[PDB]
Amino acid sequence: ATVNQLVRKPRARKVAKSNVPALEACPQKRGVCTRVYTTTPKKPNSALRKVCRVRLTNGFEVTSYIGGEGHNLQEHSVILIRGGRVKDLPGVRYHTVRGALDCSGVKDRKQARSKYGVKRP
Amino acid sequence: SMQDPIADMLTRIRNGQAANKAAVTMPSSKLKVAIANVLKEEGFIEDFKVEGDTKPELELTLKYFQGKAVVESIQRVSRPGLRIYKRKDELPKVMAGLGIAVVSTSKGVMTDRAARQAGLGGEIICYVA
Amino acid sequence: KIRTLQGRVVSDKMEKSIVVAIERFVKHPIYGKFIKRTTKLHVHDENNECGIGDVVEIRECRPLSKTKSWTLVRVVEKAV
RNA sequence: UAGCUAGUAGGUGGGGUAACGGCUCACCUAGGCGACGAUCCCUAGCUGGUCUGAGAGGAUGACCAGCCACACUGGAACUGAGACACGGUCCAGACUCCUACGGGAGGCAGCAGUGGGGAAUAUUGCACAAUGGGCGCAAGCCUGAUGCAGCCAUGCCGCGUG
RNA sequence: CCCGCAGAAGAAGCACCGGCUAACUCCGUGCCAGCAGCCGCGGUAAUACGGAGGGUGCAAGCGUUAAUCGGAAUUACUGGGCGUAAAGCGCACGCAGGCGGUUUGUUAAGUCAGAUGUGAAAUCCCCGGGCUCAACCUGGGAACUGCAUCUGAUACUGGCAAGCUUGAGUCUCGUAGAGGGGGGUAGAAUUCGAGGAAUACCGGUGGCGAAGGCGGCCCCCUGGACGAAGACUGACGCUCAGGUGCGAAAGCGUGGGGAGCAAAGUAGUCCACGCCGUAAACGAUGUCGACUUGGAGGUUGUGCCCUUGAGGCGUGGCUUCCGGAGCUAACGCGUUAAGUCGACCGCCUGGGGAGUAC
RNA sequence: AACCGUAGGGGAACCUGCGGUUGG
Numbered sequence A: 001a002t003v004n005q006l007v008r009k010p011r012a013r014k015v016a017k018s019n020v021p022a023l024e025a026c027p028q029k030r031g032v033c034t035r036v037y038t039t040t041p042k043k044p045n046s047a048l049r050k051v052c053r054v055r056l057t058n059g060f061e062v063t064s065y066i067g068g069e070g071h072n073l074q075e076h077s078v079i080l081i082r083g084g085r086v087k088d089l090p091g092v093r094y095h096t097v098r099g100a101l102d103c104s105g106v107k108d109r110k111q112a113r114s115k116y117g118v119k120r121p
Numbered sequence B: 001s002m003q004d005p006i007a008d009m010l011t012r013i014r015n016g017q018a019a020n021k022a023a024v025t026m027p028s029s030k031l032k033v034a035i036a037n038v039l040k041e042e043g044f045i046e047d048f049k050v051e052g053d054t055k056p057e058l059e060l061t062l063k064y065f066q067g068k069a070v071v072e073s074i075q076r077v078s079r080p081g082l083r084i085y086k087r088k089d090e091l092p093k094v095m096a097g098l099g100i101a102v103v104s105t106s107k108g109v110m111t112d113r114a115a116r117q118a119g120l121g122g123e124i125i126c127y128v129a
Numbered sequence C: 001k002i003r004t005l006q007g008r009v010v011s012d013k014m015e016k017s018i019v020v021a022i023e024r025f026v027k028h029p030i031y032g033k034f035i036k037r038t039t040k041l042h043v044h045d046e047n048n049e050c051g052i053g054d055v056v057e058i059r060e061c062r063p064l065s066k067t068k069s070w071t072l073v074r075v076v077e078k079a080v
Numbered sequence D: 001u002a003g004c005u006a007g008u009a010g011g012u013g014g015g016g017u018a019a020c021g022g023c024u025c026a027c028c029u030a031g032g033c034g035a036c037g038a039u040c041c042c043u044a045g046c047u048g049g050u051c052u053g054a055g056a057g058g059a060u061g062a063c064c065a066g067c068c069a070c071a072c073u074g075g076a077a078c079u080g081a082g083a084c085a086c087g088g089u090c091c092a093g094a095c096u097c098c099u100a101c102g103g104g105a106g107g108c109a110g111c112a113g114u115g116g117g118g119a120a121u122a123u124u125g126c127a128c129a130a131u132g133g134g135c136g137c138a139a140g141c142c143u144g145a146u147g148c149a150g151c152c153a154u155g156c157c158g159c160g161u162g
Numbered sequence E: 001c002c003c004g005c006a007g008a009a010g011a012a013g014c015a016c017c018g019g020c021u022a023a024c025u026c027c028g029u030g031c032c033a034g035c036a037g038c039c040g041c042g043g044u045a046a047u048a049c050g051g052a053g054g055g056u057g058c059a060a061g062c063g064u065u066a067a068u069c070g071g072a073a074u075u076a077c078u079g080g081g082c083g084u085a086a087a088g089c090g091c092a093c094g095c096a097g098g099c100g101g102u103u104u105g106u107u108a109a110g111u112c113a114g115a116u117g118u119g120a121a122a123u124c125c126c127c128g129g130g131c132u133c134a135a136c137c138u139g140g141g142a143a144c145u146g147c148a149u150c151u152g153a154u155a156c157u158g159g160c161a162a163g164c165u166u167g168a169g170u171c172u173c174g175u176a177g178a179g180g181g182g183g184g185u186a187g188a189a190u191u192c193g194a195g196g197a198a199u200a201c202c203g204g205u206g207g208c209g210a211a212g213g214c215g216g217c218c219c220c221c222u223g224g225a226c227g228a229a230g231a232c233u234g235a236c237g238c239u240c241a242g243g244u245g246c247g248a249a250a251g252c253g254u255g256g257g258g259a260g261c262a263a264a265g266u267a268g269u270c271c272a273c274g275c276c277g278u279a280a281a282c283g284a285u286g287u288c289g290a291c292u293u294g295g296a297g298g299u300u301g302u303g304c305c306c307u308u309g310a311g312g313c314g315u316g317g318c319u320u321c322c323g324g325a326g327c328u329a330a331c332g333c334g335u336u337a338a339g340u341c342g343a344c345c346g347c348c349u350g351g352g353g354a355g356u357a358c
Numbered sequence F: 001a002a003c004c005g006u007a008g009g010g011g012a013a014c015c016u017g018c019g020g021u022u023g024g
Helices: A003-008 B005-018 B030-042 B112-118
Strands: A035-037 A051-055 A061-065 B025-027 B047-049 B057-061 B074-076 B100-104 B123-128 C005-011 C017-027 C034-044 C055-065 C068-075
Touching (some): B005 B025, B005 B030, B030 B123, B100 B112, C017 C055, C017 C068, C034 C055
Antiparallel strands (some): A035 A051, A051 A061, B047 B057, B074 B123, B100 B123, C005 C055
16 A cells, blocks of 8 residues: 555554453363263264363353263363364364363373373373 | 656666667756766666757667666666665665665765765665666 | 744734744654654743744743743744 | 533732742633544553564563552641651541440551462571661661572473483 | 492383374274364274384473464565455545656755764673583673764755746637537327327447436537647646535425336326435546557548549547557456556455344 | 346245346
């Protein structure tokens, strides 16, 4: 553009929208796991799912996928959501770290162990 | 032109180089004569001649060494609206010193090398390379 | 003397006080274009010896009133 | 957010301050700011700097140093060279404590801690031996400033595990 | 910090292995359990799921996630675009702003050079010094890209005055055209002598107008364009956010009219005034000025040519078609640019949600 | 034939009238 068109109105920046708007600059948050679901995905995939539904301490309620190979979550247990949106099923844009507050590390793991709450044998 | 005569002169020179012309005409002025002198000193044009009494018509004689022309790149730096004034140690070196940068200092319209040697800078006029 | 900024009398309606606008040529901090910029200053003169449209020379003195800290020393030109 | 301001803009006179000044008063003139963004709404301590980037730029103000603002919330004043005053006084309100039920004492945004909130941030430690400050004619006294120590791979660097 | 004695004695983990990206084979499962930063794996021989072996990277650390910058030329001042991908206001006039053809003199505000003050210390950078090296500490310098004052330079930009004509504008003479408005008027046709609407042939790749748009003939008022030779004014110029005005068709309000057509045969289509004024208002190309090889063809002005002719030669104005250099991703544009440059304005930043709500 | 603006109508895409475009 002409230099005058920039002197009058400058170059506006591009605002950024965070992917996870409930963490509000926090790598972890505590939940309550108000409910547990097994809903179906959208894209062609071989599973139903393994998700949950926790209410963060700051009021927000967001879904949270549950990784691993079998969980032990109840309707009144606290979790620790971290992030890492999940592509397949829409609406889930979080995760659940294992072995932090009331979860447990899935069993028999011996590769990529630190990602779950599994100690060394 | 109507709002910038130096850009008109440079455009005429460039188009003459493109169309393999031998001589271009344009209304003359003191600044144009100074720029033509600076161009003929460094060797980017063969010669130049001015005629007329009340409405002069400056006429150059473009020179090409081989099939390819000599003046391959020429542009206006400080166009009216974005006047550019550079100090002594900020004078530009076009094509790593292979070209010239016609500046206008308090002594006269001179190339960038003479201005850097004398120890003064001014308003850049055009890059020639 | 002093810095002696020179401006143009914009309005003379107050009693024993005038408004003078000084001029400044400043480059834009990021685009490098010479924009024209003005600044308004309340000037205090006792004789009412100017007219709307003149060019004056003002200097700095002690604060005489709220938002009035300049005094007129000499008028250069006239209205027309 | 397109109109704002009537002690508002100016002028003589008193009054006041260490000092200029509408800071205040009585009168008169009717002005002053605004598209070069006034008024209004949200957010925000500022700077030397830090991170990134070839550079121009972009994002923030952790530690260290300068400046400003507050000291449970709101308001005024005295003493003093200096405060409209963190560990000074008085006034009005909610809080916590003592009580003979009449009335009274408090302010960890000081170091160390406790309760709570949180994903998360430490010992109710030693000494004035050094630097610095207060008083003192000097010894000397006080100094959670400061010098060190205790906890945590939080980060940078070096070594070992032959 | 130094010295001495047993004993190698007490001290290695984490992530990845299809591509991006360094590093592969077999078993359990068979679109199930699952992995995943993107592309994405399996419905029975998984180098992608889980496990074993193997090598790859880092190493007292290794990975995941939050936050900034870079890659992002992905808000482009250095450093981008608007004919078809997102992007040229529906047009004209124009205030404030942006920009200024040519010559002389003066001023020295912008600009340039030097000096003097200040730009707190640490940090960043260079040459060194010391903790057994390094991190760390520290001496000197440079830098702190900045600001103000003084002394100078005068080419450029800016201020003041006097100038010149090529930019711009005025006058004379003519030309063409559905340019606009007012009011009459004629013929064909349709309907029922009456009434309303539109003007067959001319008619065109045609003309006028800033756009929407404008058709019988004559009369009146008026606007614009073009061509030839003079004089005069002497920069009076270009663009334009806000602003005023004009602005198919449909619709709304008042009073008329209503032949044909025709939403729902009614409104409407027609008239005066008033409102709305939005479109695929399109060349999907803003306005102004300068420069750059040619050929085919329409219209018009003027000069010229035994003007002897329907005619031929230019030179101008407007306007169609094919193409060279050049531009573009391509199609294509191509002297009437989408080519080379200059001045000014609006708009563009993945698609939908949405030109939606407030 | 499609699309745009506008008006009316209809369970619904949509139908019709008026004017414009070639993105027939």
